[PDB]
Structures are given as C-alpha cells and as structure tokens.
Design a protein around this ligand. Structure first.
Ligand SMILES: Cn1cnc(Cn2c(=O)nc(Nc3cc4cn(C)nc4cc3Cl)n(Cc3cc(F)c(F)cc3F)c2=O)n1
Ligand SMILES: Cn1cnc(Cn2c(=O)nc(Nc3cc4cn(C)nc4cc3Cl)n(Cc3cc(F)c(F)cc3F)c2=O)n1
Lengths: 301, 302
C-alpha cells in the first residue's frame, strides 16, 4: 500500500554526530568508538580554502587545535591523523552509543539515507542516490559539511558518504568514510563541474514495475525487444546501458508481475520515443530513477 | 541548494516504539512514561474485525492478555482503559527514553513525519500531509498499524497521528493520540469512502516561493490579481479557496523574495490555465502541495 521515497530511521546515526572546530572553521563530525571522523577541510582558514597545502597545514597543527563537542560534553583530543580527505581525531572517550557499523563504498545507482546536520545537530532525513556522474542531489545549506549518508541492515549501519561541497550546478560532492572522493573532485573551493548526468535505466525499470505492482498499467504495450535494440535507444536518450546482470536483478520484480524484463524495456522505449501523454505514473509526471530494485521489493511486500 | 521532502530525525521517537499482542492480533504501540498507547483494534480476533463490539470485547480482557515487548525487554501490564479508538495500557516501568512530548491535533494541510514500524521495530521515515479530506497518502504495509506521526520543536516531540487502517482507495486513515479519528472513519473492516480531496492552495504557493529561492524563476510573469479573482480560478481547478490568513502566513516568504503574494497567485493562475509545457519546477513536473510555508523556511534557511 503506497509508494514513497523512504529513509532509514536515523536514531543510530544521530547518536554519533559531533561538532568540530579548528580556529573559526566549523563543521560536523562522526564519532565512532574513540575516533572522530570529519572532512580534512576543517584545517583550512578562509585564505587556505582556495588552494590548500594539506600536508603543510596539518604538520603545523597540534591536538589542542581541534575542539570537539558532543552537545555540551567536550571531548579531549589525544591524537590526529590524515587519511586521504578525511581527518581522524582520536579522543579520550569512546562513544557509548557507537552502533554496529561498517565503512562501505557504494556504486552509482545505489541509494542511501542522508542525515543533514548543522553544528553537530541533526536537522533532517531523506534518501539520495549516487548519480552516474558521482554527484548526489541532496538538500544542503552552509554548515552541512561532514553530514553522512548510510544504509542499515539488521542493526548494522553501513556508512557510505560524507558530504563535502556544493558544485556550481547545485549538486553535491563527497567522499566515502576512508576519505576517497566519489568522482574526480578535489577538496578545494574552486569551481568544479560534474559531467553530463545520465539516467539509471535499471532503476527506472524497477520504478515502472512498482507502478504495475501498485496500479498504473497504461504504459504497458504489446511489444518486446532485445537488449541490443533497447541499448541503442537507451544510448540516444542519455540512459545507462542495460546489462544482463541488470536483467537478472529485475527478475524478482518480473516474477511478481508476469511482465518479462524485455517486455518492460519495450514499454520504456515507447515512453521515451513519444512521451508520457501528460498522464501520471505512481503520482509523478516524469520517469523516476532513484528507486533501486531492492527499494521496490522492500516497500511493495 | 536543492529542495526535498525531508522528515525529522526519528531518534527520539524510535526509543518509544513497542510491540503489543493480544492473542494473535499484533500491532505497534507508543511507550511514554508508564503508559503504552495503541489502536484498540488489537483486542479483535479474526472473526471480530468486521463489526466489533469494543466494549463487550474489552470487558472480557484482563491485564495478562496483553503482551507488550520493548525490543527484548518484556513489560508488565498493570492496568488498561479505553479512550475513543485508543487503548491505554499502564505498565510497571516508565520508559527511560521518554522525550519531552505533547499530543496535538493538526489541521488539514499541515505536515508531519511518519515513522513506519512493524512488530515494534522502526522500519522507515517519511513526510506526510493531512489531506483536506482527512486522509493521508503514505506507505504502509501489513503490521504497520500503530505507527505514529510527529513534528519536533527543538527538543519537544509533538505527536499528531497514529495509523489505523488502509481504505478502499489505498489511502490511509488514523486518529490523534486521544483516539479521535481524523475524518469520518471508524475502526472496523468495512468499506469506507473518503470524500473528494482538494489541493492545498497555500502549500503550492509556498512551494513556488521555494523555487524562486533556489533559482527556478521561469513561472514569474507580468500579471497580478486579486484574492477574489484567484479563487474563481481556484474553485475551478479543485483548489482550496485562499483566505486572508493564508496571505498573512505567506508574508515572510513574500518579503524574503520581494515577490508580492497576489503576484505569485497570478503566476499560479497562469500555471493552472496553461500547464507547464514540459518544463519542471524544483525538479517536479507537477504542482506540489505537501510543503507548508513553515517547511520551506525550515529547509531554505536555518
Ligand atoms: C550551500 N552549501 C551546500 N552544501 C554546502 C557544504 N559546504 C559547507 O558546509 N561548508 C563549506 N565551506 C566551509 C565554510 C566555513 C565557514 N566557517 C566559519 N566554517 C566553515 C567550514 C566549511 Cl567546510 N563548503 C564549501 C567547501 C567545503 C569543502 F569541504 C571543500 F572541500 C570545498 C568547499 F568549497 C561547503 O560546500 N554548502
Ligand atoms: C496494507 N496496509 C496498509 N496499512 C495497513 C494497516 N493495517 C494493519 O497493519 N493491520 C490491519 N489489520 C490487522 C491484521 C492482523 C493480523 N494479525 C495476526 N494481527 C493483526 C492486526 C491488525 Cl491491526 N489493518 C486492517 C485494519 C486495522 C484497523 F486498526 C482497523 F480498525 C480496521 C482494519 F481493517 C490495517 O489496516 N495495512
């Protein structure tokens, strides 16, 4: 019953958010066990933000230059290190609400939940997908740097994203929890452009299945096609190419509906070659590509 | 940058969700202080859910017939009562994770965050609006009965919704935290109709202001209008009539953008009479009506 963009409950992540100040530079940090993870951009003064020398900026810092607080509680810093673009501050207190967790690096098209924070305080929760151009379309204001994205499986939080910066097109770029950027970006206040974005084809098909699995069925037709023929149409419309693994992943959704994957690909081809007739699918007048096949089954049980 | 449907952090509410069982009938409850709140429909067996006599069913229940489980902690029921459609089970242990809270009854058009739960375990969170016909368009599966909706003011949790049932339309219907249904529905398995819905005009206008704040400006045009002339068009497209209180509410968004409210109404009238011509606003190809004026301020600033 119903189909919505749905985020994971954020309580386990809320318990891990702290404020990190270095000089006057302020951002959010992630407190797991006795380590606080935050973007290394915190060690940059306004005059270092455009072209920072992170090796030289950090060598001149000491433990007492980093102020970390979890609400009113102060955490004394007893060590600091740099791993790629992530600063690691060892503290004297282990977080008592540290959850079961793992650091993972997600693939384009995969989804996760974002907890937007400001000055170490959670502000809102929503779901994002990693775009094929390695950006995300979130909702972030000044002070959001260091907010994290995550998935939860069986009480284990998989941290996958740390927000770093906003790009000129308004999209957002960040790293994994090991400090490695998604995409070719760098941690510097320079104008950096994302590539042309493409549509996650497997996700659009999964969303089309969810519609039938709900009720919308006007887009279904009598045709079928081949993976090769569809991918020729997919390339023209800035859609990701479909692989046999994509076809295999959509198997469960294809089983419940009795609609062959290649039958749905033919339906999608027609929607692209003509239009959506100004009619709506699952309450939207556009083709939605930020629902994974897993997102669909877990909501359409 | 960007504008999305954004739910409140659910941590304070997660620590209050418990499982309630009565025989084999199972649903979710809300544990605050020494009281667990849940839909009274839990005291129905399979053969009772069609036309239950709740007073007859309750009189034959005793404390030990209610199993309340908070994760792996078992709670002990030392009393029970019925308030409207909500059953209240007093337990021997006050919830340590009880936040500063409040029970409120929202108005049609107001939004809240929903924490969907199954078997007393939280499962997901999203934003909903109370439709003008007192239904909500959410995402609920079997076993979601008892999930709650809420807003957060700094540290105070304002509970405004408890989920009861899915209607024929597929829409969802529930009560406030004193057991009173939003709308004309009853807690029984019978076909119930909700009236025709209408579009929350003041919420659409607030959404249009958010687009201006985020750099989406193509719909602003050369016209102005009057409140009375706009409602002629609004009544025509199944929109709520616009009041002076709506105009006053949109005041802050008007002043921050420099666009008069009546001017934005005229741009909305044009959008209603000509469509969008394949263009999008804030990444949507429709007029969104589930963002209140307060939602826009909370997200576009602070
Ligand atoms: C509008 N918007 C959308 N997303 C963001 C995220 N974001 C951010 O929150 N902060 C940034 N710069 C800082 C300025 C500070 C001023 N004080 C006093 N303290 C500050 C701390 C930060 Cl991090 N930036 C810009 C930015 C941050 C980076 F980490 C980076 F590598 C390059 C950048 F250009 C920012 O984008 N804002
Ligand atoms: C698809 N969907 C969307 N929303 C809902 C909510 N919902 C629900 O979760 N459960 C319901 N009936 C029960 C059956 C049970 C079987 N066992 C073993 N235990 C059960 C407990 C319940 Cl509550 N219903 C139906 C329903 C629930 C009510 F509270 C009510 F007053 C009338 C109703 F018809 C339900 O809608 N499911």
């Amino acid at each position: 019953s119903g189909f919505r963009k749905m985020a994971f409950p954020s309580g386990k992540v809320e318990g891990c958010m702290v404020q990190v100040i270095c000089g006057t530079t302020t951002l959010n940090g992630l407190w797991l066990d006795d380590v606080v993870y935050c973007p290394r951009h915190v060690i940059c003064t306004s005059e270092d933000m455009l072209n920072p020398n992170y090796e030289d900026l950090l060598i001149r810092k000491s433990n007492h230059n980093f102020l970390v607080q979890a609400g009113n509680v102060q955490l004394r810093v007893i060590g600091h290190s740099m791993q790629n673009c992530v600063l690691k501050l060892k503290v004297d207190t282990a977080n008592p609400k540290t959850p079961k967790y793992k650091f993972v690096r997600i693939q384009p098209g995969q989804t996760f939940s974002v907890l937007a924070c400001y000055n170490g305080s959670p502000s809102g929760v929503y779901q994002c997908a990693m775009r094929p151009n390695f950006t995300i379309k979130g909702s972030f204001l000044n002070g959001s740097c260091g907010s994290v994205g995550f998935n939860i499986d069986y009480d284990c939080v998989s941290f996958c994203y740390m927000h770093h910066m906003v790009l000129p097109t308004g999209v957002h770029a960040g790293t994994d929890l090991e400090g490695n950027f998604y995409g070719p970006f760098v941690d510097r206040q320079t104008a950096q452009a994302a590539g042309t974005d493409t549509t996650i084809t497997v996700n659009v098909l999964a969303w089309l299945y969810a519609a039938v699995i709900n009720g919308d069925r006007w887009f279904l037709n009598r045709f079928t096609t081949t993976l090769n023929d569809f991918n020729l149409v997919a390339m023209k419309y800035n859609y990701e190419p479909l692989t046999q693994d994509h076809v295999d992943i959509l198997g469960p959704l294809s089983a419940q509906t009795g609609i062959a994957v290649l039958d749905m690909c033919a339906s999608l081809k027609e929607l692209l070659q003509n239009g959506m007739n100004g009619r709506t699918i699952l309450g939207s007048a556009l083709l939605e590509d930020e629902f994974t096949p897993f997102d669909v089954v877990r909501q359409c049980s």
